[PDB]
Design a protein around this nucleic acid. Sequence first.
DNA 1: TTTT
Length: 124
Amino acid sequence: KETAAAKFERQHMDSSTSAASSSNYCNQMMKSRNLTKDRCKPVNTFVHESLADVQAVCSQKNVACKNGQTNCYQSYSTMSITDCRETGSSKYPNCAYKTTQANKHIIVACEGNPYVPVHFDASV
DNA sequence: TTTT
């Protein structure tokens, strides 16, 4: 079983690109990390930061969770994020999404020993 | 699957 934080890594992290490449980039990656298998995920955002620095967001701004929990954390900084939004046409099987690239703050939920991201919560 |  994939750990919650490994899951996070797979689902939210593309450190080997500073930003989006094509507009196909969401389609390439959503599918690359298997978010298009039974799921057709509605949206997914990808931080183009090193890991080391994204678990750094755990010790930063302690903000509420969109969903009402106290263990979320705002990035003191701006991070480049690509966001992939399901386009009407995307039909699971063969899913499609709009690649939007941004520098923004991201809020992730943390837990465990060690404290790390398990949940990508929001961006601002 | 409303993205822990």
